[PDB]
Amino acid sequence: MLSFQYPDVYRDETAIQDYHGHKVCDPYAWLEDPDSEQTKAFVEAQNKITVPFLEQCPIRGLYKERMTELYDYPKYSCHFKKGKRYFYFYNTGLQNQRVLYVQDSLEGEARVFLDPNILSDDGTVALRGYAFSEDGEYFAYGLSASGSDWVTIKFMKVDGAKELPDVLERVKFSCMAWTHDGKGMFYNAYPQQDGKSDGTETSTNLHQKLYYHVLGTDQSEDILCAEFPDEPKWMGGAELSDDGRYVLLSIREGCDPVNRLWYCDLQQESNGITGILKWVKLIDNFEGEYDYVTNEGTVFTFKTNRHSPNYRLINIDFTDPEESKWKVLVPEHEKDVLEWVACVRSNFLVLCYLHDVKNTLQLHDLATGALLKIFPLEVGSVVGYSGQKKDTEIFYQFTSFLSPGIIYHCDLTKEELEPRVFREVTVKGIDASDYQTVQIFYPSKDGTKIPMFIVHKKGIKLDGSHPAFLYGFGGFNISITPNYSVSRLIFVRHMGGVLAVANIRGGGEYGETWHKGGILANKQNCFDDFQCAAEYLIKEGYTSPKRLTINGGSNGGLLVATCANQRPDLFGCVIAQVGVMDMLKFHKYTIGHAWTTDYGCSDSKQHFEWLIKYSPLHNVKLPEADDIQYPSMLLLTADHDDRVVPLHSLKFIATLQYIVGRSRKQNNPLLIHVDTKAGHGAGKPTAKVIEEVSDMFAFIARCLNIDWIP
C-alpha cells in the first residue's frame, strides 16, 4: 500500500541532555523552531506525502459529500436575555461561523447582530469570548485569528449594533467583566514580548495581569488592578457579584480545580478604580475551588470541592469568614458530581448533576437548598443554559449521541415551573431509532470499573467483524459526556462502524478522586484504562484489533500516542489530534506550564521518572515480535496551534518514521498533516471541520480497507 517515501529528516545526534543522570537524545530538537527553513521544509515534505495518501481513495470524497449533506442542519444556541433584548447564536447549516442574532422580544423579528463570516473569506476569524454590560446596552467581544488563543477585544453599542473605537490587544486566557456603573470592563492581558504573538510562536506566557478598561479611552490608559510579579504563573480572573457591589478575583495556578478567592467591595475604593484595588484575601491558598453562584448582602454562595470531591454548595459570610462558620447549603452527593450551578429569578438555583456520565437538571430554593423541581431529560448532556439572577425564565439545551438535541424553555413565574420544548431540529438522513447507545462498566487492570458508552446499529452480531472507533481523553477533570456528532454517525451508517467512548480516570466523571486517579504518579492508570476499554470491545465481539481505531485530541492525543507505543498489537489505526507528545519539554512553551498539575514537570527527579516511562516521543520502539508492527498512525496538527505547539507532533512523527517507518515489517503508514490558518480547534470554521473529519475517516478506510456503504 505504501507507494511513497518518507522525507529525509536530519538527526542532530549531538542534542543530548542529562535529566537527573539519564541521558536523553533529542535529534529532532530543531523542529522546535517553527520559523526555520528546515522546519518549514519538513512540514511541506510531510504534507506532500499525506495529502495524496488521504485523497487517493474515492471514499474521502464520498465521506466529504455525505458530511456536507448531513452536517447541513440548522444549529441554534439557547436564547439569552441581556437588558431589554434577546440574543442567540444560529448557523443556517454550513456557514463557517455561527452568527449572533438579536430580537426585541421572543415573538419579535430577529436581526443579525454580529456575523463573524464577513471578517474573513475562509472563516478563520472567530469569536472567542464576550461580555455584555449589566444593562445590556454595550457589548465586548473577543476575536481570534487562525485559531490562535490570542484575542483582540472589540466593542459595540447594542442599539443599532454600532462599532465603537475601543480595541484591546495582548489579551489571552481572559475574563471579561463589566462594572455595573457601565464605565468599563475588567480583562486580562500579557506584557509585551519579543518575537511574534500570532499563534505561531512558542514563547511561554507569564505575568498575566488584570486591567480595567474605561470605555471611550485608549488601552494605554487602562488601570492595572492586580498583578503577581513574584508568581509569574498566577492568573487572576475577575467577575462582578450579581448586585455589582464586589469584584471577585479567582486566582489560578495550573489546571487543578482550585483557586484563591479575593474580593473588593467597590464602594470601599477611595476614588473609584484608580489602581491596585483594596483586595481582601478571603481564601488565600490553592486548596479548593470556590465558584461564585450568587450573594445576598455579605452571604456568598459558592460551588466548592473543599473536602467534597463530588462538589457541593456552601455559604460564606464575608462578615464571619472562618471556615468553621461556613454553612453547607446543598451537601455533597455520595456519587453524583455537581457540575455547575446558576442562580435565577432571585431565589432559585439551577443545579446540573452528572449521574453515571449523564446529566440531570433541577431547581432548588436559594434560602434552604431544598429541591423544588426536577426537569426531565433523556440520556445525554446539558450543553447550554441561560438565566441570570434578574431573569425570570431559563433556557437549556440538551444533546445526545443520536440527536442534535432540544432547547427547552421554562417560565419561572409560573407556579408549577413546567418546561416546554422551545426548539427541536432533526437531521434528515439519519434515523435515530436505527441505533442504540448502551453504557457498560468494564474492570481496568487494578479492578476499577470504568464506564464506557457504545453506540451501534441495532441487531448487529457481536462476532468481532465490525470496525470500531474508540475515543478517550482522560485528564484535567474533564468529563466526556454524550454529544451529537454527525461525523461519527456517518462512520456507523456508511462504514458499518461501532462508536465507543471510555470514561477513563483523569477525567471528572466521578469527581476529584476520578481526576486524581489519572494524574501525576497515576497517569499510567489512564493508559491502562483505555487499553482495557479496547480489550473489552474485542473480548465482547464488537470489534477486533485489526479493525479498531483509537482517537483522542490534546491530552487525548497523548493518550492514543502512548497506547500505540505500549500496545501496538491492540490497534489497527490511531488518529492523534493536536497531542502533547514531548512530556519532557511541554512546560517550556506557551501555556504548557499550566499542565504540570496533571503531569508533573521533568525538573523534578520524581516527576521525570513517571514521565519518561510514557512520554510518546521517548517510547517509540520496534515491537519485539516479528508479527507485530505499529498500527497505522495519523497525527493532525496546525501551524497556529499555540495551545499545544505543533513541534510536539513534528518531533513525534519524525521519530516514528525513523525508528519504526524504516523497518521492513512496517507496512502501516505513519503520517502527519499540518493545516494552515488553524490552531488547537476552538473556532475552527465549518469548511475546515468537514475537511478534517474527511481526512480522518478516509485514513481509517484506506488503512483498514473499509468500503463505503451507500
The verdict on whether 680 is a catalytic residue reads yes
Beta bridge partners of 450: 442
Q: What is the C-alpha separation between 404 and 460, in angstroms, rounded? A: 24
Q: Which residues of 184-201 are buried (b: 16+ CB within 10 A; e: fewer)?
A: bbbbbbbeeeeeebebbb
Question: What contacts 701, CB < 8 A, 6 or more positions away?
Answer: 57, 59, 60, 63, 495, 707, 708
Give just the sign of the alpha carbon dihedral 666, 658, 588, 677.
Answer: negative
Phi, psi dihedrals of residue 499, rounded to the nearest 5° = -100, 140
Alpha helices in 229-297 (DSSP H): none
Alpha helices in 23-180 (DSSP H): 37-55, 59-70
CA 335, chain centre distance (Å): 24
- What does the DSSP assignment read for 623-687? -SSTT--PPEEEEEEETT--SS-THHHHHHHHHIIIIIITSTT--S-EEEEEESS--SSTT--HH
135 is catalytic: no
Choice among 308, 554, 632, 694 that is catalytic: 554
What is residue 708's DSSP assignment?
A: P
How many residues are given for the chain? 710
Given the residues 587, 593, 618, 680, select the one marked as catalytic. 680
Task: Annotate 315-327 with DSSP letters as a single string.
Answer: EEETTB--GGG-E
d(CA 377, CA 360): 7
Of 256, 582, 641, 695, catalytic: 641
Burial class (CB in 10 A: 0-12, 13-18, 19+), 501: buried
Q: How far apart are CA 586 and CA 581, in angstroms?
A: 8
Nearest Cα neighbor of 80 from 420, 413, 388 is 388
**562 contact partners, CB below 8 Å, separation of at least 6:** 527, 614, 616, 619
Q: Pick the closest to residue 256 from 208, 298, 309, 203 (CA basis).
A: 309
Work out the angle at residue 71's Cα, subtended by the Cα atoms of residues 438 and 123, and round it to the nearest 5 degrees. Answer: 130
Q: Which amino acid is located at 157 in the chain? A: K
Catalytic residue numbers read 554, 641, 680
